[PDB]
Amino acid sequence: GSFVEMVDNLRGKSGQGYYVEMTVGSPPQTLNILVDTGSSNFAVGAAPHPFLHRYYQRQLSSTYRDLRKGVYVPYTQGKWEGELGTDLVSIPHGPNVTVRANIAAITESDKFFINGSNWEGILGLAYAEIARPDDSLEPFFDSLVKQTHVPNLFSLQLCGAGFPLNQSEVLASVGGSMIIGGIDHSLYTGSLWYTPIRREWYYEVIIVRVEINGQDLKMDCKEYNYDKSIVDSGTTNLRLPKKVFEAAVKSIKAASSTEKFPDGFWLGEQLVCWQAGTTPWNIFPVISLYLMGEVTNQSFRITILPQQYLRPVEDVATSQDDCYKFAISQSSTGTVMGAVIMEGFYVVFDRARKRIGFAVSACHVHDEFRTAAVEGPFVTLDMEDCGYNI
Numbered sequence: 558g559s560f561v562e563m564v565d566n567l568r569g570k571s572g573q574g575y576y577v578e579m580t581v582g583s584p585p586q587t588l589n590i591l592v593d594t595g596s597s598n599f600a601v602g603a604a605p606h607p608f609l610h611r612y613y614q615r616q617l618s619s620t621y622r623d624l625r626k627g628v629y630v631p632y633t634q635g636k637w638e639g640e641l642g643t644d645l646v647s648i649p650h651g652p653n654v655t656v657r658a659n660i661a662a663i664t665e666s667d668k669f670f671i672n673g674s675n676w677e678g679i680l681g682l683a684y685a686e687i688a689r690p691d692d693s694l695e696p697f698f699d700s701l702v703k704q705t706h707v708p709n710l711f712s713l714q715l716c717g718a719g720f721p722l723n724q725s726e727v728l729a730s731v732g733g734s735m736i737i738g739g740i741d742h743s744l745y746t747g748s749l750w751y752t753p754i755r756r757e758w759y760y761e762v763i764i765v766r767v768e769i770n771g772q773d774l775k776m777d778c779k780e781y782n783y784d785k786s787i788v789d790s791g792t793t794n795l796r797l798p799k800k801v802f803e804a805a806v807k808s809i810k811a812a813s814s815t816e817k818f819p820d821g822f823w824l825g826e827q828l829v830c831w832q833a834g835t836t837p838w839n840i841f842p843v844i845s846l847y848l849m850g851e852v853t854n855q856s857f858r859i860t861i862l863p864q865q866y867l868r869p870v871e872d873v874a875t876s877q878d879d880c881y882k883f884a885i886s887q888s889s890t891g892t893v894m895g896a897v898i899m900e901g902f903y904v905v906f907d908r909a910r911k912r913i914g915f916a917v918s919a920c921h922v923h924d925e926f927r928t929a930a931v932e933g934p935f936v937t938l939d940m941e942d943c944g945y946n947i
């Protein structure tokens with residue numbers, strides 16, 4: 558482990574997001590910021606909100622610069638409005654550098670902030686193409702690399718606890734690591750396997766095969782990437798295109814058929830509970846996603862367990878049962894490898910070499926009989942045809 562200052566610098570959980578401490582302004586104002594590989598703006602609460610106990614106060618920063626421009630950002634599940642500016646930003650448990658970065662000061666929002674998430678803003682780590690209002694607003698990581706000697710790479714180890722964390726526990730627990738500018742070997746086991754970044758906008762990848770307990774889903778591989786496949790720390794679930802979700806759920810139901818679960822469970826809405834310690838992990842299948850490799854006609858696979866795709870939740874009766882929600886859900890905007898999938902792996906966002914690496918995480922949840930895996934190589938032909946073009 559060569560990056561001790563950054564190891565264990567994240568907190569949070571898949572349902573509410575993982576965040577890192579940052580400072581903004583002069584004197585520094587401390588804020589907790591969601592790590593989001595699915596967006597490209599650095600946007601922070603800058604006005605009072607019922608769900609915020611702190612926010613960025615521009616009038617108190619001597620280094621604040623107003624860009625005299627507003628930004629309106631609507632999402633599917635919420636929206637916000639803000640004022641653009643720049644200021645000096647640092648990451649206390651990070652590289653020992655301070656940079657001048659763009660900041661969207663959020664003045665109005667709807668369904669954006671989460672009660673009890675403990676974060677006050679978002680750090681969009683994806684590329685300028687998807688920055689708001691347009692690609693001229695340089696994202697944070699691009700500023701960091703341009704202004705310093707930090708290598709153009711970061712890596713994420715998101716650590717799911719494997720059980721519910723109450724309000725106090727989630728604040729006191731280590732949620733993982735964000736290594737800025739490097740790869741920390743203590744965070745994974747086995748080898749790192751890399752898949753190309755198809756295009757630099759989201760962190761887009763190409764899935765070439767899907768198995769449920771070794772059984773090929775057998776769909777045209779273009780379906781797996783319709784209309785894109787991305788790696789997104791800012792989505793909780795593994796999200797699959799509608800037709801892929803329908804085929805995968807049918808296969809997961811068949812593999813787990815010795816127990817019948819209600820429709821609401823498969824819809825990711827209702828929890829399922831078992832007596833303490835008796836969760837029947839073994840009846841649920843493993844899921845393997847094969848990704849395009851860096852060598853021609855070569856792929857590798859990542860394998861996740863039900864300990865990743867069943868998200869621990871507290872029972873409505875705060876009982877002693879062990880309860881979960883199904884964290885695989887349908888999408889109309891492509892595959893999203895969200896936080897519950899990332900919790901199985903150490904993920905290297907190697908921007909310098911336009912590739913994403915995966916290795917088994919040293920903090921993935923498993924049982925005595927099965928573990929997550931990253932394995933290869935496999936011979937896979939015509940992988941380019943798996944990518945979707947509009």
Ligand SMILES: CN1C(=N)N[C@@](c2cccc(-c3cncc(Cl)c3)c2)(C2CC2)C1=O
Pocket residue numbers: 571572573574575593594595596632633634669671679789790791792793896
């Ligand atoms: C899909 N997605 C992102 N990748 N980030 C967003 C976001 C915004 C606010 C909160 C969360 C969030 C909430 N709960 C759990 C998580 Cl993991 C993330 C995500 C948005 C900027 C585009 C969002 O909707």
